């Protein structure tokens with residue numbers, strides 16, 4: 001039975017981010033309104049300790065994060081340290097449940113902040129809960145696969161494990177000269193002992209469910225065969241979904257859902273995280289849908305009556321319609337990238 005990291009205090013904390021005001025509450029409330037929470041094991045998140053956060057982040061950055069919470073050299077609000085520790089601890093708790101064998105799937109939709117560096121805040125991320133979750137899972141598992149379906153390149157998580165073969169990072173993202181964070185070209189394969197253990201899939205604007213899954217399934221198939229992971233960490237940023245102010249990819253939660261299904265059928269210990277997603281109603285739509293996918297349940301099309309119903313206009317349905325934007329992804333480029341990745345994975349043995 002899937003573990004659902006939740007507490008009213010945790011949601012309230014996560015809601016205090018200005019860039020995503022009350023998203024955690026909208027995400028939870030929609031899930032609750034579909035009564036999906038009754039089909040999960042609700043686990044209260046623990047707050048991360050200083051030494052747990054120090055497993056990745058430098059002491060100087062942590063001390064400075066705590067100071068500004070009361071320098072632009074660390075990429076830096078008020079109460080931001082408590083915010084970071086709560087999310088970091090939530091992902092660790094979910095990871096710990098995976099270790100304890102309490103579940104095969106642990107969910108933390110408020111986590112997935114993958115841009116944070118060991119000493120730098122970046123892309124609205126103040127603490128890399130993804131890395132902290134992976135480092136906790138490293139206590140039991142020798143091979144961990146990290147899959148990043150955010151619109152942006154998971155540069156923080158990749159750089160964290162760029163020199164190791166214990167963790168492989170797969171990231172599908174928009175890659176363009178000028179687009180944040182600028183890294184993650186297909187040529188990027190990690191460095192040193194961790195060479196070819198970093199997979200990057202540069203994708204252009206306008207991509208939709210069908211072509212996206214064809215890329216994702218193709219990559220994950222040969223990754224699973226070559227790397228053969230013992231645990232999976234899934235980052236599912238909803239800023240790929242149509243309607244997002246980023247306005248890059250043209251995805252629907254159904255396409256992301258199929259990628260999720262293909263991963264879940266591996267039947268491995270899976271850590272589910274959120275991340276990006278700045279159209280709040282659409283983000284709630286996506287993760288609620290994906291939660292239903294995890295539970296193997298089909299959700300009703302009409303948005304249930306709840307606190308944030310008025311935010312789902314003008315359609316007030318769960319399904320999201322792709323935008324009328326053209327697809328900038330040419331078939332030859334994709335195959336040229338796929339074949340290149342396919343060649344890199346052969347070196348993994």
Ligand SMILES: CC(C)[C@@H]1NC(=O)[C@]2(C)CSC(=N2)c2ccnc(c2)CNC(=O)C[C@@H](/C=C/CCS)NC1=O
Pocket residue numbers: 115122123124150152180237275276277
């Ligand atoms: C307005 C827009 C540019 C927004 N920015 C901001 O709200 C602020 C806080 C105001 S100006 C600024 N940051 C900025 C200026 C120059 N360069 C960067 C940021 C590099 N960082 C990003 O582009 C992250 C990027 C978000 C990434 C989410 C990854 S899940 N942020 C933004 O889209």
Ligand SMILES: [K+]
Pocket residue numbers: 148149150151152153154171172173
């Ligand atoms: K990504």
Ligand SMILES: [K+]
Pocket residue numbers: 161162163164165167168169190194197198
């Ligand atoms: K790696």
Ligand SMILES: [Zn+2]
Pocket residue numbers: 150151152237239275276277
């Ligand atoms: Zn993003």
